Subunit: 192 residues, 3 copies
């Protein structure tokens, strides 16, 4: 049960836009309990042509905000991911809510809405986008927020993924199925 | 047994130049089963005058292709690595064949030779090389394929590393035994 | 017991400057036993006024040198880290000197003071420093040396961290609580 994910290759379960009437992408998130820290693995695959065109320009920004409750269960209504996470006990969602907080980011490490302590609970790094026709690689800046702020009375934990493109003439086409490359990461996990 | 590796400080076990009939590099590969993911650790060291006199050029491309059978076993023949991977249980491999599939990259999140899913199963990142005389750092792109294509009937999985340099004037002498800094990756292990 | 650390959020446990009568930074370090590997986590925070004003220039290089005795305990004398690394069996240390070795960097994969092997035991990568007023990032260079050399007869293993700024005009203020973003690393653990 040391794993909590989206599933290997899942169906469209994102909402890359503050409008979209449905799911436009395909987030693949794999969290694994490693004692003190949690092991991250993140990768996005745009499903909606609207999201598949964003890159067509020269600069873009996609961010997905995830919110959990006090027991580490995804809150579909609040968070951009609209499909619950499950812990691989098959490849199918495992039952027995034995607490998923084990995968939750320590609020003592990653404090909520605090000043005189300014953010300093960010994850920064680079992932890459492989060009449609040409197989080139454009570096897109990725950063994980971690307990951004609780927008809801029922938000106890938060993990936010933000990809930022800012190059000179991205793939001008659409075959740009937009595929962010895997971004490996870790964060101090919540106590028990 | 969470560990499948090349062993600590192995002996020449690669075939880097697509020409050599002898091993010209020492590859260190360590895979550790961690829930639904597999923690990777690669580093490479040059052995032959040939390989070592590569960063003497402002441009290089070394690539190692590994192929395993349905039982997570390495195909020495089809691979550039000519020594089977072993599981930590001493510092010496452990016997029995409970199957090394648990370390094999899931052929569901990373499919084989087909279109409509054109690549997107690549892990791109950056590792470094630290000059001989001086102590300066050179960025050298790394990218891990993952089930490129079954170059043989008896191929179940494949993992291909690829170190590429592209700067302007690198340690041009020779002592350059060549050394990639370790690069850390993670992918979705095979079901079981 | 697979978690050796400083503890989520610690007290200035450092000694960056080769001067400071006392500590001046808050190093956050998490090691995790993981098969033949050790998954690391690193983030440093500036406490002193002197430190929090380094990034008021264009360059800087700070290095926390670490050393352990044959059983894997942090030798506070020789290190710039002045508080032993406790085991996580609460959020407060764990007893039973059943050995912390398993967390230590294999003296074989990473040898000590020697030639014919010069250096070749560094981990290089980039983490980031966010701007105080602007929400920008300035990439710094962190190298992890592993088993540098043994400066004392009681030195068994060592893990040296080095961060390096080398850009052009950094957050010239002081608000610079000097918070380096987390740096994920892995190294091959000592036999047992």
């Amino acid at each position: 049960i040391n794993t909590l994910w989206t599933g290997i290759n899942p169906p469209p379960n994102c909402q890359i836009v503050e409008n979209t009437n449905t799911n436009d992408g395909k987030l693949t998130l794999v969290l694994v309990k490693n004692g003190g820290l949690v092991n991250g693995y993140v990768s996005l695959v745009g499903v909606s042509d609207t999201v598949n065109q964003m890159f067509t320009q020269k600069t873009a920004n996609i961010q997905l905000r995830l919110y959990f409750d006090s027991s580490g269960n995804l809150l579909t209504e609040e968070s951009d991911l609209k499909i619950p996470l499950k812990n691989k006990s098959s490849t199918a969602t495992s039952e027995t809510v034995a607490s998923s907080k084990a995968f939750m980011p320590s609020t003592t490490a990653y404090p909520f809405n605090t000043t005189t302590r300014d953010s300093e609970n960010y994850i920064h790094g680079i992932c890459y986008y492989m060009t449609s026709y040409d197989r080139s690689l454009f570096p897109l800046n990725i950063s994980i927020m971690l307990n951004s702020r609780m927008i809801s009375s029922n938000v106890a934990y938060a993990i936010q993924f933000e990809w930022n493109l800012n190059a000179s003439e991205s793939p001008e086409s659409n075959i740009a199925t937009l595929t962010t490359s895997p971004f490996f990461f870790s964060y101090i996990t919540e106590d028990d």
